[PDB]
Write an enzyme that holds these catalytic residues in place. Structure first.
Site, mmCIF file in Angstrom:
data_model
loop_
_atom_site.group_PDB
_atom_site.id
_atom_site.type_symbol
_atom_site.label_atom_id
_atom_site.label_comp_id
_atom_site.label_asym_id
_atom_site.label_seq_id
_atom_site.Cartn_x
_atom_site.Cartn_y
_atom_site.Cartn_z
ATOM 1 N N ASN A 163 -6.988 -28.600 -16.245
ATOM 2 C CA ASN A 163 -5.850 -28.262 -17.422
ATOM 3 C C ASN A 163 -4.575 -29.599 -17.172
ATOM 4 O O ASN A 163 -5.021 -30.531 -15.957
ATOM 5 C CB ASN A 163 -5.041 -26.820 -16.976
ATOM 6 C CG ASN A 163 -4.493 -26.093 -18.722
ATOM 7 O OD1 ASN A 163 -4.146 -27.122 -19.544
ATOM 8 N ND2 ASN A 163 -4.558 -25.355 -19.171
ATOM 9 N N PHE A 164 -4.030 -29.950 -17.786
ATOM 10 C CA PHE A 164 -2.812 -31.121 -17.579
ATOM 11 C C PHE A 164 -3.373 -32.911 -17.393
ATOM 12 O O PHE A 164 -2.579 -32.799 -16.934
ATOM 13 C CB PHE A 164 -2.021 -30.337 -16.775
ATOM 14 C CG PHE A 164 -1.492 -29.083 -16.931
ATOM 15 C CD1 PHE A 164 -2.060 -28.374 -15.851
ATOM 16 C CD2 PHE A 164 0.159 -28.354 -18.051
ATOM 17 C CE1 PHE A 164 -1.261 -26.349 -15.510
ATOM 18 C CE2 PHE A 164 0.336 -27.414 -18.132
ATOM 19 C CZ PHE A 164 -0.222 -26.368 -17.027
ATOM 20 N N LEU A 165 -4.456 -32.385 -18.306
ATOM 21 C CA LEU A 165 -4.957 -33.917 -18.618
ATOM 22 C C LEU A 165 -3.940 -34.707 -19.391
ATOM 23 O O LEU A 165 -3.440 -34.467 -20.467
ATOM 24 C CB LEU A 165 -6.419 -34.277 -19.007
ATOM 25 C CG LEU A 165 -6.645 -35.334 -19.662
ATOM 26 C CD1 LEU A 165 -6.933 -36.746 -18.811
ATOM 27 C CD2 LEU A 165 -8.061 -35.015 -20.566
ATOM 28 N N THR B 107 -10.218 -26.239 -22.273
ATOM 29 C CA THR B 107 -9.525 -26.581 -23.645
ATOM 30 C C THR B 107 -8.473 -27.509 -24.499
ATOM 31 O O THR B 107 -8.368 -28.121 -22.955
ATOM 32 C CB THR B 107 -8.998 -24.828 -23.978
ATOM 33 O OG1 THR B 107 -7.702 -24.848 -22.703
ATOM 34 C CG2 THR B 107 -9.686 -23.574 -23.609
ATOM 35 N N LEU C 88 -3.502 -22.512 -20.382
ATOM 36 C CA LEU C 88 -1.930 -22.805 -21.210
ATOM 37 C C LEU C 88 -2.318 -24.240 -21.374
ATOM 38 O O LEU C 88 -0.750 -24.438 -22.579
ATOM 39 C CB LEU C 88 -1.049 -23.144 -19.438
ATOM 40 C CG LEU C 88 -1.011 -21.946 -18.605
ATOM 41 C CD1 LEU C 88 -0.646 -22.340 -17.291
ATOM 42 C CD2 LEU C 88 -0.433 -20.986 -18.967
#
Ligand SMILES: CCCCCCCCCCCCCC(=O)SCCNC(=O)CCNC(=O)[C@@H](O)C(C)(C)COP(=O)(O)OP(=O)(O)OC[C@H]1O[C@@H](n2cnc3c(N)ncnc32)[C@H](O)[C@@H]1OP(=O)(O)O
Ligand SMILES: O=C1/C(=C/c2cccc([N+](=O)[O-])c2O)SC(=S)N1Cc1ccccc1
Length: 436
Positions: free
Chosen positions: A150-152, A186, A436
């Site tokens: 996450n948070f790329l 995602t 998230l």
């Protein structure tokens, strides 16, 4: 070629207001009909993956960001707050807070060398960030030991530099040498590997402000007033024996949760260590900083009927004299037993029973959210959401979550979406994990 045809139609249904990297990766191709689920690569082991930093260009270096470290953690949520939105003139910026990443990047098993970044050689300016976290997944019956990415982020100036692949290749390298060979990721965009697609939604908590900020619109032949009256919530929550989540409740809820959750084809399997951590925030944070809000229902005696959760993720608003910030409450994980004394999940009475309870709890999640000084409550059509989304005035929201599984093939999992992009009230969703 015959892969692009199916792809275009996927982008076309996700239409809303060639791929020479994944080409070379263990990801399910578009035309690929899966006969048997499982890994895509021949099983490797740590000694096949070298421990050497992947070649960045000149002037860049790799760097682990320690969350616990005040200095480094700042560099993360500063890079995110300024670049994690496409448009410069959008009117809204993301607002990642020190409180947020201390919850989202500090999960049981978190390695600081797994919170990857790229800094400049001379300046030390963090220009890239892609982190991960160790989890086990429940990909349709089977248990998959993996890692959630996450948070790329790539700094806006260095976009279209093909640096994203490198940041993946590296986070792949660093994970693989730990005996973990799969992932769940995602994204909003369409890529070769969609195991499911879910749609975003919006319950207007403070319509007035939302309309005054350009975040929602006025329907035709409708008064500004009419909308304010429509979304008018009460101040106090309605369902009896409802309270917050103490540690004393954990052993009781954890069971009820994974019991309820063991109905989704894709889930994240929880341990009591990562469960307490995900659903209880820092000891004493003020309402305007607090991250995760979890609520439960204690039956008079001491039994726990149902629980829900939700997390704050605020925007900072720009070009607007009246408002400087917008509060967003995202729906998270939930459990309930209203459909436990039934043999079939899709039984008509059992669906009604699950529904009218989910309607109660989530309606209260909204009140408790509005009270937490949020302006909009978000949902995903995933899980059993479809039961209440229409009823609870959760307006249809433009934007799709595409669920992907790195190094693993699986059949399409219901995402709560009909052929024509409407809420599937009859089938709901087998997607049970919330990213998230
Ligand atoms: C072993 C365990 C490891 C497993 C690995 C897990 C997989 C990790 C995958 C990452 C999971 C992320 C999940 C999240 O957190 S999604 C969150 C990503 N963030 C945002 O969308 C908001 C801010 N946006 C940005 O920073 C963008 O500008 C980025 C940098 C993301 C791409 O903008 P840019 O123009 O600078 O790209 P590029 O030139 O560097 O690179 C081009 C290539 O990168 C592919 N691309 C672009 N965006 C994404 C994306 N979000 N997921 C997967 N792939 C993406 C793209 O298809 C193309 O490849 P191909 O189509 O040519 O082949
Ligand atoms: O909420 C949004 C937007 C979200 C968004 C965009 C692109 C990619 C992803 N994603 O997860 O990969 C997104 O979530 S864009 C947007 S504009 N809004 C809110 C909004 C709607 C309409 C008017 C103003 C503001």
């Amino acid at each position: 070629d015959k892969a692009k045809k199916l792809e275009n139609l996927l982008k076309l249904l996700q239409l809303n207001n060639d791929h020479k990297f994944w080409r070379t990766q263990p990801v399910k191709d578009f035309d690929e009909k899966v006969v048997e689920e499982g890994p895509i690569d021949k099983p490797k082991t740590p000694e096949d993956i070298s421990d050497k930093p992947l070649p960045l260009l000149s002037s860049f270096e790799w760097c682990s960001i320690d969350v616990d470290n005040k200095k480094q953690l700042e560099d993360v949520f500063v890079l995110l707050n300024e670049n994690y939105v496409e448009d410069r003139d959008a009117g809204f910026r993301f607002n990642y807070t020190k409180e947020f990443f201390n919850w989202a990047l500090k999960s049981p098993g978190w390695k600081k060398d797994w919170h990857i970044g790229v800094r400049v050689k001379e300046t030390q300016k963090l220009v890239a960030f892609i982190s991960a976290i160790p989890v086990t997944l429940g990909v349709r019956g089977k248990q998959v030991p993996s890692v959630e990415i996450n948070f790329l982020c790539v700094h806006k100036q260095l976009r279209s530099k093909r640096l994203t692949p490198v940041l993946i290749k590296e986070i792949t390298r660093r994970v693989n040498k730990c005996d973990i060979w799969h992932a769940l990721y995602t994204a909003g965009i369409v890529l070769p590997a969609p195991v499911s697609t879910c749609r975003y939604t919006h319950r207007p908590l403070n319509w007035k402000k939302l309309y005054e900020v350009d975040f929602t619109g006025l329907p035709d032949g409708h008064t500004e007033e009419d909308m304010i009256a429509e979304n008018a919530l009460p101040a106090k929550t309605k369902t009896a024996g409802l309270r917050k989540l103490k540690k004393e409740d954990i052993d009781q809820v954890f069971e009820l949760f994974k019991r309820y959750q063991s109905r989704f084809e894709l889930i994240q399997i929880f341990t009591k260590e990562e469960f307490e951590h995900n659903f209880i925030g820092e000891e004493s944070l003020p309402l305007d900083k607090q991250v995760i809000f979890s609520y439960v229902v204690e039956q008079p005696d001491g039994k726990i009927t149902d629980f829900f959760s939700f997390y704050s993720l605020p925007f900072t608003i720009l070009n607007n004299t009246k408002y400087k910030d917008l509060g967003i409450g995202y729906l998270y994980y939930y459990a309930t037993d209203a459909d436990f004394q039934f043999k079939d999940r899709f039984d008509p009475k059992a669906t009604k029973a699950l529904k009218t309870r989910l309607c109660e709890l989530i309606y209260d999640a909204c009140i408790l959210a509005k009270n937490a000084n949020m302006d909009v409550f978000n949902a995903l059509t995933s899980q059993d959401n479809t039961l209440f989304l229409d009823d609870l005035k959760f307006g249809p929201g433009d934007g799709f979550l595409n669920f992907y599984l790195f190094n693993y093939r699986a059949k399409p999992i219901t995402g709560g979406l009909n052929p024509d992009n409407s809420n599937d009230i009859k089938r709901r969703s087998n997607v049970g994990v919330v990213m998230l």
